Amino acid sequence: ACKDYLPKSECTQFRCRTSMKYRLNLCKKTCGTC
């Protein structure tokens, strides 16, 4: 359902914490949002 546009090194749970882009724009899950 939720894939990643980058590796765990690019999409950090932190990204979804404060950065919206990395969540929806980049990876779905890897960023911690699915």
Q: Which long-range contacts (CB under 8 A, 24 or more apart) does 4-12 make?
A: 4/28, 4/29, 4/30, 4/31, 6/30
Q: How was this structure determined?
A: NMR
The answer to whether 31 touches 12, Cβ cutoff 8 Å, is yes
Rounded Cα distance, 1 and 19, in Å? 21
Enclosing domain of residue 34: 1-34
Round to whole Å and give the CA distance between 34 and 22. Answer: 11
The total of structural domains in the chain comes to: 1
Count each helix (H run) and each strand (E run) in the chain, helices first. Answer: 1, 0
At residue 13, the 3 state secondary structure works out as helix
Mapped onto helix, strand or coil, the DSSP state of residue 34 is coil
Give the C-alpha separation, 34 to 27, whole Å: 8
